[PDB]
Amino acid sequence: QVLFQGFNWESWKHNGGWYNFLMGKVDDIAAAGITHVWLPPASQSVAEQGYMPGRLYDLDASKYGNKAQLKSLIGALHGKGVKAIADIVINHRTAEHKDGRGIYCIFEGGTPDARLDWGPHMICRDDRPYADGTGNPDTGADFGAAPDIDHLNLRVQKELVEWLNWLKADIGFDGWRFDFAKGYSADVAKIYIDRSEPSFAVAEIWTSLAYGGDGKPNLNQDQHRQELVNWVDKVGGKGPATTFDFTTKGILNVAVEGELWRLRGTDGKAPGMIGWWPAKAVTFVDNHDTGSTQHMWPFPSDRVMQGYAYILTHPGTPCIFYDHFFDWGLKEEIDRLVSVRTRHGIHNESKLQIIEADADLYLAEIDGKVIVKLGPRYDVGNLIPGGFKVAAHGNDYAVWEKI
Ligand SMILES: [Ca+2]
Ligand SMILES: [Ca+2]
Ligand SMILES: [Ca+2]
Questions:
Q1: CATH value at residue 365
Q2: 92, 271, 322, 355: which could form a disulfide with 265 (CB 3.0–4.6 Å)?
Q3: CA geometry: angle at 287 spanning 292 and 315, to 5°?
Q4: Which ligand lies nearest to the CA atom of residue 52 in the structure?
Q5: Whether 96 and 30 share a structural domain
Q6: Which terms under GO biological process does the entry name?
Q7: Residues with a beta carbon under 5 angstroms from ion ligand 3
C-alpha cells in the first residue's frame, strides 16, 4: 500500500485545473507501484485550497476543477488499479447566510433541498460568535477562523454520513483522510468510519514533539506517539482507520542532520508510531503543510532522499508527496526504492531490526531481506552480511537486498 499525495499548497492555482493536469500523471503514478492517491478537498470552500468548506455537495465550485473532472480523474485512477481517497474536512464548516443576529451561521449543503442546510444549533455550544449556545460543546479542538460542527447532533451525523456515502457512490472515492482529526473525538470519527465503511481511512492528529534543554526534540517521544496509538485504538484497531505518523516525521527531520542515533529509541526499537503499531501508521517525509510553500515543519531538502530511503524500506504505510516525486527530480530514485520495497514483499508489519544508530550511521534490516544504511559513514563494510547486493544508493543512503 504505498500512498501518494496528489496535490500541494499551490495546486489550486494551476493553469487549466489540477484534476485535468493530474490526468496526465496517472500512468506514471500507476507505474510507480502506488496503490492510493490522496486528493485535495473537493467542495466549495472560502479558502481556495479547500480546507474551509461551505456547500459540501458543490464540487463544481472547487478551484481544482469540477465534479465532471473529478469523476474523469478518479475513473482514470481506477482504470489503472489505483484507489482515490478524499480529504474530509468536517471539524468546521463556513456558513452561507447570516441569521438575523448578523452572524454567518446558516449553511447550505449545495442542493435545492435541505441536506446539510444547518443553522447555529449545529454549531458547538461555546464557539462564539457563531454558535447560539444551544448545541453540544465541542467534542475536541476548535478551529479559530470557522464554525465548529457539533458532531454529537444526530441530524449532523446522518446528513454528513449521507455526504460521505455520496462521495463513495456518485463520485467514487475509496477512503478518507480526516483533516484535523483533533477537532472532534475518536468516537465521533468512528461513527463516520464505520458507517461509510471506506477501504482506507487515515486521520491527521498533529501535535508537538517534546523539547528538552537544548531546543531539540527529546529522543523519547512516547507521550506523542501514544496519542496516535490511542486514536486508532478507540476508533477501532480492526477498522481501516490509521493515522499519519507525525512522530517519525518529527524525529527524522532532525535525525537526518547528523543525529541518526535518534532513530533507535529508549527501547532499541524505532521511536515513531511505526515502532509501536506500524500497521496503523502511515509515514511521510513532508506534506502540503510541513513542506510545500507553507514550510510549517520542512524536511531538510538536501536530505529528503534519506527520508524516503527510510520510510520506503521500513514498516508502516509510506506516503510519497507530489513535489518530491514529480517536481524535485527524484522520480527515479523514489521509484527504485518503491521497487525494492515491493519486490521483497516489505509491508505494514515487516519485522524491523536496528543494527546501529550512531550519529553518522543508521543501519537497519527489514524482514531479513533488505538493509538500509543512512549516513555519511564510509566504513559500513563489515556490518552488512554475506549475500547482499546493493539495490539502490544515492546521496547518504544505500540499501542492499539479499541477493
Ligand atoms: Ca439547500
Ligand atoms: Ca471555531
Ligand atoms: Ca472541533
A1: 2.60.40.1180
A2: 271
A3: 145
A4: 2
A5: yes
A6: starch catabolic process
A7: 91, 138, 140, 148, 183
Q: Is 204 a catalytic residue?
A: yes
Grid-cell match 543501519, residue found: 363
For residues 198 and 179, membership in a common domain is answered with: yes
Measured in Å, residue 386 CA sits from the centre of ligand 3 at: 55
> Do the annotations mark residue 269 as ligand-binding?
yes
Examine the domain organization and report whether 312 and 364 are in the same domain.
Answer: no
**Contact status, residue 262 vs residue 209, Cβ threshold 8 Å:** no
**Residue 90 in 3-state DSSP?**
coil
Q: What technique determined this structure?
A: X-ray
Can you give the CATH number for the domain in which 157 is found?
3.20.20.80
Helix spans in 90-245 (H): 154-166, 186-196, 222-236
Q: With contact defined as beta carbons under 8 Å apart, do 312 and 397 qualify?
A: no
- Do residues 323 and 353 share a domain? no
Domain containing residue 9 = 1-345
Please check whether residues 88 and 219 belong to one and the same domain. yes
Please tell me whether 180 is known to bind a ligand.
yes
162 belongs to an annotated ligand binding site: no
